[PDB]
Amino acid sequence: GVLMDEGAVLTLAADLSSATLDISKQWSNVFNILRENDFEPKFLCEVKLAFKCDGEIKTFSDLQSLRKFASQKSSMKELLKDVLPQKE
Amino acid sequence: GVLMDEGAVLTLAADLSSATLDISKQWSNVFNILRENDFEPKFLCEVKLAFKCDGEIKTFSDLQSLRKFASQKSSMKELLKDVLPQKE
């Protein structure tokens, strides 16, 4: 009868179709109103770990990619060891 | 000292060249070890607002696109009218 209906939008595959990552194009007001009115907003995404390593900031949007880095990192080798098999 | 150089890495235009959208293919361990070792991991990324709106769960990874939604949504028009320009 009366409804504002949306159709069906396909999903893009980040590993299967084309390598896709995140980059901030948004601003400071994030789900604030939704948090107050309890719309139960989300907050889980493929965060790119922009962390400080050896003097430079790294950006990893994939732990699989970070695995390749952490493994050959003598220091980080003993850090990610718990989720990534080490010992070379 | 000698260490580990890399090649040449570039970035992607956020929505300017192609739509930047987040899709979770990661698992449970979210940069935990990096935090415990104080590499200072990130967290600020383009998250999808997977919230309950009008009975259905919506996913908005781009709040710009959400502005297009809440403007036609009378319900959310009364929520976001405080931050978004509403003449209605």
Curated annotation (Swiss-Prot), chains A, B:
Q: Where are the transmembrane segments?
A: none
Q: Give the family per the record.
A: Belongs to the transposase 22 family.
Protein's name according to its UniProt entry = LINE-1 type transposase domain-containing protein 1
Q: Which organism is it from?
A: Homo sapiens (Human)
